[model samples]
Target chain A: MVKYQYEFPLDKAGKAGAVKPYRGGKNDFVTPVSNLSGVAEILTNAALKATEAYSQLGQDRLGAVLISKVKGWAYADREGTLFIEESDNNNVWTTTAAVNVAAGVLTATDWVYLSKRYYRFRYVNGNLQQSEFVLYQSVGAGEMDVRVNEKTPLQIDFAENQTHDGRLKVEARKTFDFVFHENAESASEGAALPVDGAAHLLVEVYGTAEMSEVKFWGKSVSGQKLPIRGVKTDDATTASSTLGKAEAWAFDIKGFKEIIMEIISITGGTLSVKGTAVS
Target chain B: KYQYEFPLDKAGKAGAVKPYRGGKNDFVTPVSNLSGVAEILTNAALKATEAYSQLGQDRLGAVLISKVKGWAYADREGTLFIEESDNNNVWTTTAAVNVAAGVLTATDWVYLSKRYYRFRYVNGNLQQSEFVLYQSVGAGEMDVRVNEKTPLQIDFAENQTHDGRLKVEARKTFDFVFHENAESASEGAALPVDGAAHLLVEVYGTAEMSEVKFWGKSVSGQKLPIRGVKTDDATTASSTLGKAEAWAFDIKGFKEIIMEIISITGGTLSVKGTAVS
Candidate 1:
């Protein structure tokens, strides 16, 4: 949307040495040599990288976030979208999107539309492409509704020895049901057959993850937490899931004013704790 | 009489994991039959008027006291009998249960007076199949009539509920009856058909089962092989075909259908044959 000017301090072997002068603000930007090739190279790189600072530069008019006083470039967005020079001059910027150039394979035209999320694509000519892979670019947050799993009751990062603060009120229920969702993405697809639902949910964990120790306490009438039912008395026990084979486990919170559990040594994985009060 | 199979999920702890050991502590959510009143609470969880959870010990080591499953508790005239010793000084008595068998019994019994009486453990299994039977009744068409097979032999059939074609199905499973054996064919039970003119038979084989042959018996005491006509293929009247396929037969005088299993390694095979009158 706009043009940006930069200066580079060039000296010797005529390799543009440092990016110094800005908008010709400084008098002595370079003790120039005869080789004109290095000036164009350093000037080209400086303008390109300034646009990479989109994170600090805010949304629009990002000509090119320049990397260090060093030499590198990056787009601030997670679904990396890059802005390229469009003007006849090196310092000028334009809004015309960049082309992917992978014609026979992807697309020869504006490829940003092709790399977004959940695109329904079909072959064109030889083969067409799915126009979107970056989730935000496509359907936005996908859907908004009830999917059985509603809340997270516990979260732990064993690597950090950090247990997320979560509590549940187990006053008068026969039993609280829990199950492992092998496919956390889809509730129906999981190791547990007859998939159960939960009014409460936690972070979802998969791949290689663990819980070091476990402890239980009840928030009493005095709003004080105390261990009961002859459970592991310590605040947090151990993980490696060696106790229950890390498959599934349960605790008896029969006589508690309120209940909560401590999942220790939660190394990794988005470990989601879910339970449905089954009456 | 058929049975409905509600999943008996033994969740919680797989085994005695030191700190926790739960027995028959199940959570059952029954799908209510058409008429809300027809809940299949055959041997449902014990019901209590007041809340009570007690863990005590008597001559026996320990007793789990809670709203228990697998036991049908009903008090007739306020008193009944139980094997649990009437000796726990704290509560009342003690009950015996096979520990390893996963059945829990309270060692001490309390609250014997406040009409808090249990007759005995209701002995039974969850032998029911979740059959969503499609039925056309006096009430036009019930979206889906689902229940256990044994429980559906209701009064409606005898009454003027117009229970036409109350549509029931039967199935049988078989191993490689002829594959490994030297026998030419493996004989099976005969399914009787009254005076039906036609019959529809279906066979499902998990693996590649070469074929299943059909034999029909005539009412004149003459039994012989019957030709099978694929409901779609009109080439010939053959008596054999691969599984996961169907066959139609003209059994005007046939009294019963006899199935023979012939295969290389049939793996698992099942058949459900229906006769048309």
Candidate 2:
């Protein structure tokens, strides 16, 4: 078959041989001066072996890879720091450092190359039921990507009167926005809210729009609970027909998924709505 | 990594509010065709990845690896032990087929002697591995199991009988059943997984109809639950009527799917759904 010649030095893990197409003849001119075909066979076999190895190179079944997506990974990262907390411990980290013990840090969602003792703490929080809740161990250097599992929040820009049943789901954090077309309050008529995880919510209402009286409602997962009312902060206006009016509510939402803003009446214009639902 | 790319612009949407229309504040408002709305809608439909991502074999990673049974255990299905590429690409599989459970106590059943292993997922849902390589492996008796802590498991009616195995089965094996809202019915078209994760399932119907269940099957021909709904109220009234409704399903990894009237207790409910690849 066709083959490429390697003059001398090889890349990491013989990567050159693996990434290149395989050949049956002697790949180099210097060493194969002896039994030509014999040497050729051996070289061809080597190429096959290298290709197979490459196929399996990147995978690490061992818990060595610093992939948070891995099951039972003991280390987690945020910002530019690495955390070594007990398994499933979200609140407290046993030890923290800026990634490489030598003093290099990785940005959020960026992987790095480093290794350390992944201690398996046998206690809860910081309190030890008996004595110690930790250990001492160190792993050799390795490669890792600091990638967060966060996805871009769902967005619907410049939407008009329409039922946006995008069925967008959220985890940990939920955010929704209905940028009431600048001064399109009177022209805007519809509902906005979150579904399923009706956790807690915070509405930040602001923009250059007028308002009369609007009823805000919190919907439940089972569609049982009905309506409520409100928004925070305000926006653009000159006279009574101005933009600036908002109110915040924490005690009103009980497992509410979204806060729907419906203007039964309008004076000046509608306000831009921004909200977040949290657990 | 697969990338779904789509784009849109915000112009017809007003952001600045002036007292009245065209008085002294001559602010230029870019005019868009009233029909531009229709064009945008068309653009959205044609642009969304799901808008064109084919379902079925076109998007086939569901049955990546299937029915890898335990060798020595003859009574029930045992976890698989694969010798990765680094280990000469050796793989030990059960004899015969998807037939009766193996009797481990029988002559040929035993345990694995290999140490290499590549976990397919974390806590049993999100995939975290590819083909196993030269990484570490626990050659001893390792208890590979389904992540019990994960909230994505569904309790299908026949979840266990088809289960014919022992120890912990991986999450992917549970297929459709191991997802959120495994069997609950919602008022409208909504899937359990994030819309971005899989093709969404769409379903709609007139209430109080008999119940037709949604199921996703793997290459192994094993049926798993997508959801179970009571078409209407809880009356399972013995009715064999039919009034079909339309919806969709996010049959992400399933080889194929089917829907049938699994229950006949109340109203007659007929349904058909669309799934993207």
Candidate 3:
């Protein structure tokens, strides 16, 4: 073993010869000096044992220094004011105001960092507002891109017809079309008239291609009976066609609440009546 | 260096082994299983301070000894029996002496198992009594094969036409044939006066072969009234060939429900009603 020497003040010891001759011809200098070397070796061994104990303890602890280092490398700070570096397109280091280290995890509530890529933020107040281009990367299992465009309004236009000049404007005449199928008429008690209002109702029947005649009537909202309107047919060219072949009717319905139409008579074919109501 | 020998038989002087001074250089032999071995190794290295002492060995020993065991295998004598075999084609069953073990996934379906391929067993009475064929394969998906050849008997038939010679056997009938162009007077309500003790009402009218009219009336216990019944040219030989047509009606009569058939007059159409009730 290599030897090391230490100096002591001359007054702290007896005469050199008398002190050296104290123990078994090997005086205090020889015996005590060798004992000091042994003591130093014991102290060094104690330090090595302490280091091993510290390493084992670190392994057993949930979030040891080594675990914290690994976690810091893996995840970004939980909550922080994000910063972007558009020029370099990279993320700089983050400064955390508070750090909580748990089992293999670390969370920092207040962090200041910079990113190189483009970033967007959305805010919801009374209405939702977002940046021009928002890109979401695997929010859960899907990726989405949302963009907001400029708002536009709608416009309406109409075509030309006989009743009114077709234009990009609203008109006073209100016209709507209706059909009378099997559900519209009952054989035993004819279907109730389906128009409502205190206006002079005019209807133009577009008879089916077959020569069957369609009849119409106006019944009181209550149980009162009214006169039947003349019949109409699909082949008539003018309103002067016979009762069953007439094309249209203008009824001066003043007190009636609704006008009902039904096919009360059929001539040669299946009955299908379609009419347009003008009020 | 001092040397010590085991089983010393010869006597020696007091200074033979330098009075045998013992201190930290001495050691105790360890016993017990893994823990004793670990302690012995720890002390042999002077509490793991020597350069030869492996610190990792202690850590490795701690992990190995503390590890949980006995999880890799299970005994077969309990209530459950698991079968494992190398042969792909055959199953060798270990007979279960108790109710807890048996061939699994067996079922008895109310429908014949031959007709359906897959069945699920449900336990209703401590035994496999109810077996239902699974119709749904997944959340909103189903596999169904409907056979159109099989005639599904309906409670009632309507809006159908047949020749005069066609015979139909029915428990009760509520039917009417009419034209929309005319009206027929109501026959005062009365019970059927026929051999079947039911109404066999007949309507003979001038049938325009291709023409169709709308007739709506409820059939008792049969069906609700729906519109559009086509008029077929009469097949009766006694009626005038071109002037008259005939259609048949069958109904079971009740006293309160007034039966009415009407044909509004407009086109070459007229109807006469006769009933044996």
Candidate 4:
């Protein structure tokens, strides 16, 4: 049998072009956006206010469940903290409990710690000043790296052009690939999916800002899909500085060919994965 | 007008290794970014390779041939001659039309006009050929990426001299005010002078290049003054290198003030009011 290989084109500068052509079968294309402000539309979906609507308890309840899922969320302030509370009425409020700090960093563990408890949280009076909190629901984990200035890091801008039908399609030269856990203790020895089909699968990888850890969803071709991936947390450490490569994985999901692998998280260093389907 | 001072260091590097002889004023160190040129090179390589791949070898070869032919050829000889045959005896004569000068030499480009040809020579020799090479011995020219012009730019900072110890200060900001330039004899829709509003301006210029653009912020002292006046030099066809000045002032309840560009050179200017939500 003859092997037909299709690879992405690189420019003279050694970077992959856009992904528009490669999106379909055989040949794909890619586009690139040049400005950071334009790129933010994809990163944030044009949402500005971090908090949508505060869940007002209306009354000071002894115990109330404030259940909500944060997509890609990170926050920092001059005080380095934000408080949430259960209110008795539109005006009165009571503190539920203190959120775990995860040792002064925001990570999946911090997210987990914050998610696990039922109380409201505020930074220890003067310990930390809070400024901004970011949520990472749509953004991929592998997109981040450590730099001289972590506060303002380098940004990638993907250009999009209007299609014939008026909808925007990412230009052909801007596509990239992410490889999940194809190397793991229980990873199917022969079940690893092909990289070509990885883009077609559904995958999600997650990690926290306070702990160096990763969590993944979807089944592994080798073993029962391990939904959890993790790493050790450190203070003032960026993702590129702390992630363990061995901790990443590729999965073979059941029912649907979708797999979620946490390439990297706020706390996790580096998470990369290529997904495959089960025969 | 009030004057302000700025400080500078004699040494090129940041920090006070040696205090500049010029007196010191408020001077900030220059900021630098890591992975500067490497990132730019990598990105450029990626884009170029991608574009090349998209063109494919066959297409790229054709483009190269076209560019090479277009640059090297100029017609200096006979135009397309015609041949007339009677009873298998042929007579040839040159046509009067002058061929396009640069269209057919080794440097001139010839196109394969997607056609086929069959030839029957004297001895009943038959041969077939497709892909007719149509040499374009014409006057037109083609341009490619490699030939783009890089214009020289001016740098004001290097020209100015300053004392290292004492800082030479300038205006933190500068504002240019333009009142109504309308002549008193002008009749229709004239601007009133008495009730005028002030405008705040912001200017942007690259340190290495003296390209500058000015932006207006707000129209002062009106019941509902508009903010953000658009300058005339903002169009795409305008020159990339030039200076901009803008201001906003209001009139009374009866009418609004009109802004205009008094002068422009090497570029055309434009003015508009920015929309506020």
Backbone N/Cα/C clashes per model: 49, 54, 11, 148
Model 1 lDDT vs. the true structure? 0.31
Q: After superposing candidate 2, which stretches have Cα over 4 Å from the reference?
A: A1-182, A187-189, A220-258, B1-105, B109-277
Candidate 1 deviant stretches above 4 angstroms: A1-279, B1-184, B219-222
Off by over 4 Å in 4: A1-171, A180-239, A243-279, B1-270, B273-277
Model 4's interface RMSD:
10.4
Q: Write the per-residue lDDT of candidate 1 for residues A175-245, one digit (tens) a residue.
A: 23344332132212122212122212111122334433333344545866565332111122223222221
lDDT of every predicted structure (CA atoms): 0.31, 0.32, 0.26, 0.29
Looking at model 3 chain A, report the run of 10 residues with the lowest lDDT sum.
Answer: A35-44
Cα lDDT of model 3 by residue, A1-279, tens digit: 975463321212222211111235322221111111011000011111111210110111122211111101111112112121122222332222223222112121221122322221111111212111111111001112433222432222233331132212222334444554343222222344455543444344333334444445566756565655432212212332223422444445556655555555554444333343444
At residue B222, give the lDDT of candidate 1.
33
DockQ of each: 0.00, 0.02, 0.01, 0.01
**What is candidate 4's lDDT per residue for B164-213, written digit by digit as tens?**
33233321222232222222111112233322343333322222223222
TM-score between candidate 3 and the true structure: 0.18
CAPRI band for model 2: incorrect
Positional deviation of residue A137's Cα in model 3 after best superposition, in angstroms: 29
True contacts kept of each: 0.00, 0.00, 0.00, 0.00
* Cα DockQ of the candidate 4 complex: 0.01
TM for every model, in the order presented, reads 0.18, 0.21, 0.18, 0.15
